[PDB]
Amino acid sequence: DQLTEEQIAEFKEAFSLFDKDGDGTITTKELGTVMRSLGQNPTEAELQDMINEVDADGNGTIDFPEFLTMMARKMKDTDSEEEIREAFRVFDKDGNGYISAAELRHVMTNLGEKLT
Amino acid sequence: VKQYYFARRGETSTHDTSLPPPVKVLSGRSIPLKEIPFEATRNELVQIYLTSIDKLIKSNKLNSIPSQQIASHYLFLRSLANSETDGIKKNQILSLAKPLGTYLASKEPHVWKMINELIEKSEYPIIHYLKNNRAHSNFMLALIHEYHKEPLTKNQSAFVQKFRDSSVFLFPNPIYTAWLAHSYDEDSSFNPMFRERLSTNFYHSTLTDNLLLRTEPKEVTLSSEHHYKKEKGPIDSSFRYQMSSDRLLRIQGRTLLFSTPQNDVVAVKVQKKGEPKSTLEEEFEMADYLLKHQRRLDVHSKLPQPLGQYSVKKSEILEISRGSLTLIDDSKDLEVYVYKAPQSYFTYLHDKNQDLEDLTASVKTNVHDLFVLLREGIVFPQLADIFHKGRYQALVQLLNVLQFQLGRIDKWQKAVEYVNLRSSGLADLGDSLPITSLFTSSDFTKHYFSELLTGGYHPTFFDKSSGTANSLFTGKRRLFGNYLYLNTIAEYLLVIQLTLGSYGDKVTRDMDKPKKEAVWRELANVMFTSCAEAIHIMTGIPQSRALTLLKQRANIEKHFRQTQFWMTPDYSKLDEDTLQMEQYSIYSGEPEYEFTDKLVSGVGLSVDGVHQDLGGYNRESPLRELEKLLYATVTLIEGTMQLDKEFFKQLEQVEKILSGEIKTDANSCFEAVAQLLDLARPGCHFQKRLVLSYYEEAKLKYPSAPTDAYDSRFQVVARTNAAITIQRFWR
Ligand SMILES: Nc1ncnc2c1ncn2[C@@H]1O[C@H](COP(=O)(O)O)[C@@H](O)[C@H]1O
Ligand SMILES: [Ca+2]
Ligand SMILES: [Cl-]
Ligand SMILES: [Cl-]
């Protein structure tokens, strides 16, 4: 589809975690908290596309990429390197290979942008 | 379109309502059965432990304890202190823990360094320091027996004699719940198996029991539109099938299979000798309810279409069939349920004609709908006819007093001979049951689980002076619904194992030993996957990780080797010295399965001499890794729910500290946020991201405060989140 499986399950577990009543439907009150955990602190999401009042995971993994294909993804990948850049303007010499070894995945990270 | 459940689950006060009177009648005498409170007895032993630390310090004999055991006392005291709320009672504990710090830093300075890496890692450093063989060392009870030179009360004796195997059984609720769910992580070498003086002790069932006794009684509320609440109209059987003898394909038990131009099957199920009409009305009305809500529930089965439910003269049924063919009703009128289903709906899930490709996906289909409908509120207690009343209890140690180990499965092949799991998916749906019937004094529960509802007697429980029988078991009356819940989960997964074992035995008979071990290796993998898929449906845990959490507690190699051994008959042709020589390969640390019965040649262990049993006569099942796998499965599910519960209870505190609803200092607010990270699921990142966001917001409410302790443990969460935003952004 248009959303990858790596973050589908991340949405599935977050939804099933805050779906405290197990009904498979989530309320607006908790919905704000699931996104702050998912990485969004929005302003007013009360505008949504639901059936009558609440939304299920079917309504979740559709509403979410609508709010995920908006992000300044470039504004974030830069921020992630700032977490590692000691002084400034120097991302990492060896940490790039290391910090990618065990966070989510590591299989022959193309060693482009080398010391050239 | 919509996808949700018609069941909202919550909590209640007590399940002990309309229960049988808590009384054992022994020889005219009537013996009252009394609850021994878990949490009240737990705190007593901790208070004795704390008072005994004082006697240990005053005795100066700190060197008579191995540093590893002192490191336990210190780390627990440090962990128990941060779990404490008020600063006055918290510092009394820290007062006790400081001499163990000035001793370790002065005399054993390398141990001091190692645990000091743990204290910067977690508010409960003991839960990680006990991720290994150190958890089998009961340091708390060791100190009590050494320095509390005073006999324990009758209750403290019962608690200790029940939870002797580890000290974690004394931890307060958040620490045990966190330690238990973290004992499945990638860095955990904990398996509940200690070896005593040549004896090997398994206490995987004790983990689940110590977890359930701290829980609250669940309660499931079925919606107004649920199959068991909505008033249903009468079955509209406006059409009557025309029973043709030429199109009579076959006769399955009491069901006539009819061919049909569409290459499907029209099946007619006939009234059995004893079944009333309601049993057939139910199968009709459930298939309709499932066909209706198939999309809404994501049911993967190929449900049959119900056609009619009407009466039929027995002369027509008996005359229509003259094939191979006893079980129908007597003479006059046989009530009928007629349905249409694919040809898959009649090949049992254990058909030797199923390649591993088709079998695997048909097993996955069944386990999906099994647990998806379980959340909906539908329970299937008659999937198979398993016996040892006489029915088989999958989690037997939790439901009975003695119940030392598991049970002997008598048929294990005739038990699943006509299982209600088909290649198409679920079958026989009439034998349904509301999940509420597990949480109430139904005719089901008090008949099959009478001891769990009554209270349990044993001479060791009897108080000669009081005239009553006191036990922790009688505390389960308040919670018995949760026990039968988890037992149902293992019940489902056990029928899958007997089904897979039947399939394995049949296709490996008359067969290349390395090609035969290949079938049994994959069947071990289908069972491990099936259990992991249940954790996903029940907890939202990614199945991939639930499978890794599982493979820390259960050995897929042993399970493959024990199933192949005990589900095939080839071990019958082995002599006594050569049999015990091969059992070492299927256990390899555990004691060999000791048995006395005479081995029936060509079959194996058999009581009736014809059909193989699974275990000696009055002995346990040799499928030991299965017993671990089922207990690991239900402990991950209930243990996750409880961690998430303890997680959310703390998440409120930090929201009331940050929003200003509770006034507290800074270094006591960060303690609230740092403790929330310990209650996050293992491997779950968004939980760790959330408590990172809560932490940054705290450094704005208390910007003047120092962050020496809570720096690195949140930095790694930042580095992990940063490294994911470049890995999850490598599109
Ligand atoms: N009491 C019952 N009522 C309806 N179906 C049952 C019952 N017990 C077992 N079944 C299953 O229903 C299917 C059809 O056979 P029958 O038992 O005659 O209904 C088989 O898969 C049986 O195992
Ligand atoms: Ca809800
Ligand atoms: Cl000691
Ligand atoms: Cl008990």
Quote the tokens at residue B729: 């952004």
**How far is CA B232 from each of CA B225, B235, B284, B293, B569, rounded to the nearest angstrom?**
10, 9, 12, 15, 50
- Give strand pairing partners of B337: B269, B309
Residue B88 falls inside a structural domain? yes
Quote the tokens at residue B253: 């038990």
CATH of the domain at A64: 1.10.238.10
B277 and B179 co-located in one domain: no
Q: Which residues contact B696 (CB under 8 A, 6 or more apart)?
A: none
B187 and B254 co-located in one domain: no
Taking a contact as any Cβ pair under 8 Å apart, which residues of chain B between 596 and 625 contact chain A? Answer: none
B179 and B271 co-located in one domain: no
Residue position matching structure tokens 């470039």: A74
Rounded to whole angstroms, how far apart are CA atoms B53 and B175?
Answer: 20
B179 and B252 co-located in one domain: no
B181 and B252 co-located in one domain: no
B172 and B268 co-located in one domain: no
Rounded to whole angstroms, how far apart are CA atoms B359 and B377?
Answer: 27
Where does a domain end: B307, B341, B375? B341
Residue B573 falls inside a structural domain? no
Tell me if B335 sits within 8 A of B271, measured CB to CB: yes
Distance of CA B137 to the CA centre of its chain: 25
Rounded to whole angstroms, how far apart are CA atoms B621 and B336?
Answer: 40
Residue B11 falls inside a structural domain? no
Residue position matching structure tokens 């007997």: B498
Hey, is the C-beta of B2 within 8 angstroms of any chain A C-beta?
yes
Q: Report whether residue B432 contacts ligand 1, using a CB cutoff of 6 Å.
A: no
Residue B532 falls inside a structural domain? no
Name the phi and psi angles at B336, rounded to 5: -135, 145
Tell me if B444 sits within 8 A of B379, measured CB to CB: no
Hey, is the C-beta of A14 within 8 angstroms of any chain B C-beta?
yes
Range of the domain at B188: 36-192
B330 and B265 co-located in one domain: yes
The experimental technique used to determine this model is X-ray
B132 and B263 co-located in one domain: no
CATH of the domain at B306: 3.30.200
Distance of CA B403 to the CA centre of its chain: 17
- Sign of CA pseudo-dihedral B163, B168, B174, B179: negative
B254 and B129 co-located in one domain: no
DSSP-based helix, strand, coil % in chain B, nearest 5: 50, 10, 40
Q: Was A79 annotated as part of a binding site? A: no
Number of alpha carbons in the 13 Å side-chain half-sphere of residue B131:
17
Where does a domain end: B177, B192, B207? B192
Range of the domain at A62: 5-69
Q: What type of residue is B119?
A: I
**How many domains is chain B partitioned into structurally?**
3
Residues of chain B contacting A37 with CB distance shorter than 8 Å: 686-687, 689-690, 693
DSSP-based helix, strand, coil % in chain A, nearest 5: 45, 5, 50
Residue B146 falls inside a structural domain? yes
DSSP B261-316: TTS-EEEEEE-BTT--HHHHHHHHHHHHHHHHTHHHHT--S-PPEEEEEEEEEHHH
B61 and B187 co-located in one domain: yes
Taking a contact as any Cβ pair under 8 Å apart, which residues of chain A between 30 and 89 contact chain B? Answer: 33, 36-39, 41, 51, 56-58, 73, 76-77, 79-81, 83-84
Name the phi and psi angles at B550, rounded to 5: -65, -50
